Structure 1
Amino acid sequence: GVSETLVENFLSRAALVSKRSFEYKDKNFFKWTINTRSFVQLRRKLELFTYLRFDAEITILTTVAVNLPDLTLQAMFVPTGALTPEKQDSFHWQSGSNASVFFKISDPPARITIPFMCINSAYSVFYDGFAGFEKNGLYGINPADTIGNLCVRIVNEHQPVGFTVTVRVYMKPKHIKAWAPRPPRTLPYMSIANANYKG
């Protein structure tokens, strides 16, 4: 009986990947790039394998605090593809091509399954090489590896209360297929882009 040590059973934990509070009166919302590089508790587990393939399960938990209304939220997942919003009332929120999802605070939390979005057969977690042909191109950032952006706004117009909306995003990868294991990292991280070490 070793069935708990399975690789799908080892990584499919709905960890907090993003935690941002945005005010209401990045302009009054947040745009969070979907990547595993955020929290080192999950970043270290996924940087044990070289090539990963998974369907994510983005759970957005949102609670309100007024410096209590019943607010409507939009959570538009923009792929590696179309443009993203830059303001709160742009034309990109009313796009039909992007898989938006509308919910309220009083509802049970939002949940969508972002599928395997890469154009390779697996996500290159570690990547050795540059992206573009420019020699100042970003090292170790695969353009195929990019999931997208998860842009969340408040659907309501401006209300006379001034409140801070806390958003907690949970990404539980499922149907995980992993390849080529790696030594676990000892020294701490320095940046989320690369894999430097302090010493």
Structure 2
Amino acid sequence: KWTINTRSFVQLRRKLELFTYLRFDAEITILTTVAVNGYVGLPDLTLQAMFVPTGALTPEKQDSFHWQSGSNASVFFKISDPPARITIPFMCINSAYSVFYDGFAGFEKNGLYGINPADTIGNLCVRIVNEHQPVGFTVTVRVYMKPKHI
């Protein structure tokens, strides 16, 4: 499970932080790579990415019934495919995202400083859909975001 944010990799962070407010749609590209644990060849696995909005339940297990995705948006993609790609719309409850927020997130004094609650995206949940093999692999997922219609 990943709690979606733009603050983790500094090159994108510094460019975004040149502005106070931004409105854009997000083109998302998901790149997956696999290595055998310490050779057998590389399995062509199927992955499921599922977007879990605020207040929806996140999966507890690889095979939990949350993955049935009745109303969440999911994308299923192979490692042999080109990178999976989807667009997310501008989804702020305000007219722009707050790149900086001189304020507190809750009505009590203990809420987080510096994050506008209005800009909450949600969670990205990614599983391997295949059952495990008899041998282990390391899977790396990379997520790329391109702002557009800025």
TM-score, normalised via structure 2 length: 0.92
Deviation, 1:34, is: 1.8
- Once the two structures are TM-superposed, the CA of residue 50 in structure 1 deviates from its matched residue by 0.7
Q: Distance in 2 between matches of 1:150 and 1:103?
A: 15
Report the alpha carbon displacement of residue 38 of structure 1 after superposing the two structures with TM: 0.9
**What SS does structure 2 have at the residue aligned with 1:93?**
helix
Aligned to 2:118, what secondary structure does the other structure show?
helix
Contact 2:4 2:124 in 1 (8 A): yes
Unaligned runs of 5+ in 1: 1-30, 176-199
Tell me if the contact between 2:59 and 2:66 (Cα under 8 Å) persists in the aligned partners: yes
Q: Tell me if structure 1 keeps the 8 A contact 2:50–2:69.
A: no
| 2:43 corresponding residue in structure 1 | 69
Report the alpha carbon displacement of residue 136 of structure 1 after superposing the two structures with TM: 1.1
CA distance in 1 between counterparts of 2:23 and 2:74 reads: 23
Q: In structure 2, do the counterparts of structure 1 residues 117 and 81 end up closer, same or farther at CA, with 3 Å as the change threshold?
A: farther
Instruction: Tell me the CA shift for residue 81 of structure 1.
Output: 3.8
How far apart are 1:76 and its partner, in Å?
0.6
* Distance change (3 Å), C-alpha of 1:172 and 1:100: same
- Give how far 1:79 is off: 2.0
Structure 1 runs (4+) deviating above 6 angstroms are: none
Q: Equivalents in 2 of 1:85, 1:52: separation in Å?
A: 31
Identity of aligned residues (%): 100
- In the alignment of these two chains, the number of paired residues is 145
- Tell me, in whole angstroms, the C-alpha distance in 2 between the residues paired with 1:124 and 1:156: 39
Q: Structure 1, residues 119-139: CA drift from partner, whole Å, max 9, x if none?
A: 111111101111111211101
Offset of 1:102 from its aligned partner?
0.4
